Amino acid sequence: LDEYIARMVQMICLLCVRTASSVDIEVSLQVLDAVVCYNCLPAESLPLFIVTLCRTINVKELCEPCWKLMRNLLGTHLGHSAIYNMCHLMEDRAYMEDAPLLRGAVFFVGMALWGAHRLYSLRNSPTSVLPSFYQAMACPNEVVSYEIVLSITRLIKKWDILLNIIERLLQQLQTLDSPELRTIVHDLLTTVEELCDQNEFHGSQERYFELVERCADQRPESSLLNLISYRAQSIHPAKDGWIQNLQALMERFFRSESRGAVRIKVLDVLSFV
Amino acid sequence: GVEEKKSLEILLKDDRLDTEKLCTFSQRFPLPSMYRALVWKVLLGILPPHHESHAKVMMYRKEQYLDVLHALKVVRFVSDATPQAEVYLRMYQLESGKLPRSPSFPLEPDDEVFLAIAKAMEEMVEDSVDCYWITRRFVNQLNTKYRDSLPQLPKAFEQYLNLEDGRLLTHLRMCSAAPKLPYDLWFKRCFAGCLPESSLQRVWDKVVSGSCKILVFVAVEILLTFKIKVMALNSAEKITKFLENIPQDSSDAIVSKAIDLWHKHCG
Amino acid sequence: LLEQKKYLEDVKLQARGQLQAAESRYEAQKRITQVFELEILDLYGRLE
Amino acid sequence: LLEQKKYLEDVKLQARGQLQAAESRYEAQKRITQVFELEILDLYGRL
C-alpha cells in the first residue's frame, strides 16, 4: 500500500486502518512499526473517520526513539480538526495505570504549550486544558510527572490568573507526590521550578500561595535565599498586631531550624518590629 | 421560654454579635425556629458580628448566587426542570471546582449527603439565598471541622449507649448487626429526611453551633425510643430496615432525651 | 490608651470580615470564568 | 495617643482602598467573564 496515492475511489479504507491499528500493537521494534506508521501517514492525505482509535494507537509510541516521525504525523494531523485534545482528556479515566500512554499523550499535547508551537493556529485555551493534567496526575509515577513538570516549566516561560491557580494546584499535588517517590531528579526540577517562579515573580501576576508552598516544602531542600525572600514576604504583613502569626513564624524558624543565617535574619526582623 | 427569647433578642440587640454567647445559648437551649436561620447565618460565618454590614454581605451573596445560576444556565449543566437540592449540586461542584462534564453523570456519597442536607435545609429555611449559604457552611464545617470525629462515631455511640443501656447493645453483638449499622443518614447526612425536618433543627441548633457527637446521643435516643422494634429483630437487614422505616411520631422526645444524654456524657 | 487600642482591634475585625465577604465573590467569579473556558474548548471540539 | 488616632485614620483609609481595588479586580474579571459568555453564544450561532 506504500504505492498508494492520495486518491480514494474506494471506501474500505476505514477497515484497513482498523487493521493497521489491530496489528501495530505487535510489530517490529524499528522497521515494521516504521511501515505501519508510514501507511498511517497518507491517512491524513485523505478525509478520515472517527479516529479516537488513532489517538489511542498513535500515543504509546513516543517513549521509544521515533520522536520526529510521530511529531510530523501528529502535527500535520492537527489539521481539519481540534477535538484531539478533547478525547485526550477523555482519556483521563480508568487509565491511572497507563504511564506510557499518558506520558506520550501529554508530551504531544505540550505542543499546545509555549515550548514549541508548530501549529500556532488553533484556539490556545490553555486554562481549559490544564486541570486535565491534575486529573492525569491521579496516580504517582516518575516519568509522567517528569514530562509534566518539563512541559509546565516550558509553558511558564512568559496574565490569566486562572492558569496560575490551576498550575499552583498542579505543583501542590507535585510536592504531595514528592515525599513518597523520592527520586533524585524531581527534587531538582521542583526546587528550580520554585526558583524560576521567583524570577518571573516580578511579572508573574500570581498570588501568594507560592510563599505558603515553601511552608509546606519547608524541608531544607528549598534553597536558603528562597527562605530569605520567604521570611521577608511573610513578615511584610505583620505591622501592628497579628502577633500569633509572628510567633508562629518564629517557632518555624528559630526553634525548628538549622541554618543559623536565617535565624539571624528572623531575629533582626523581630528586633526591627 | 419567652424570657429565653428576650435574652436571645438582647444578645442580638448589640451591633457586636458575638458567637460564643449564642454558642452557649444553643448548648443550653434550643432556639426559636423563626430566628433559627438568622443566628445560623451568623453562626456559620455567613454574617459578621456587625449586622449593619450584613446589608453588603447580602449583595455579595445574591451576586455570587445569580452569577453561578446564570453560568450553569449558559453551560446548560442545570435545567429549570430540576429540584432545589439538585439545582444547588451544580453550584457546589462548581464552587468546589470539581464540577463534572456530563450532566447525567452518576453521583457520589458526598453528593447524596449534600443533596439530603439541601432538601432538609430547604424545609428549615424558606429563603433560597439563606439556604445555599447555610448548607454550604454546614457541609463545610462537617468535612473540615468535625470530620475529626465523624469516622469514629459508631464506636463512640456504642460506648455512650453502653453505660446507659447495655441490654440493647448486648443483643446487637449476638445479632451480628453491629458492624453494619449505617448511622451515616443520622450522622453524616444528619437525620436529613428520615426524621421529620419541620421538627429536626432543634438538635441542629447545637450542631451548627458546634455539637458533633450529639447525634450519637440522638442515635442513643433512637435505640431507647424504639427499643422494642429493634429488639423484636435480629438480622442486620431487619435491624437496618427498621432504622430506615422508623416511624415519624416522636422525634421531639428523641431530641429532648438526647439533650440530657449529651449533658450526661459531655456536660 | 487601652480604650483606643480595643477600638482599633474591633475596627480591624469588621473591615477584614466585610472584605473577605467580597473575596468570596472574587473566588466565585474566577470559578465561573474557568468552567466557561472549559466548555468553550469543549464545543470547539464539537464544532466541526 | 495623638499618633495612635492618626494611625487609626490611616488604617481605615487603607482598608477602604484595598476593598475598592479588589472590587475593581472583580469587575475586570467580570468583563472577561461576560466577553467569554458572548463568544460562547457566538459559536452557538453555528447551531
Describe what you observe in this structure:
Chain D: This is Hamartin. Chain D: It is found in: Lysosome membrane; Cytoplasm, Cytosol. Chain B: GO terms for molecular function: GTPase activator activity; small GTPase binding; TSC1-TSC2 complex binding. The structure is cut from a larger assembly and holds 1 copy of chain A (273 residues), 1 copy of chain B (267 residues) and 2 copies of chain C. In chain A, 58% of the residues lie in helices and 0% in strands. Chain A is built from 14 helices and no strands. Helix content of chain B is 63%, strand content 0%. With 48 residues, chain C is mostly helical. Chain C contains 1 helix and no strands. The radius of gyration of chain C is 21 Å and the shape is rod-shaped. Chains in contact: A-C, B-C, C-D. The interface between C and D is medium-sized, with 26 and 25 residues.
Task: Give keywords.
part of a larger assembly, 4 chains, A: 273 residues, mainly alpha, elongated, C: 48 residues, 1 helix, rod-shaped, Hamartin (chain D), lysosome (chain B), Rab-GAP-TBC_dom (chain B), GTPase activator activity (chain B)
Oligomeric state of the chains in view: part of a larger assembly
User: What fraction strand of chain C?
Assistant: under 5%
* Rg of chain B, nearest Å: 20 Å
Give a short account of the largest sheet of chain B.
Answer: none
**SSE topology string of chain B:** HHHHHHHHHHHHHHH
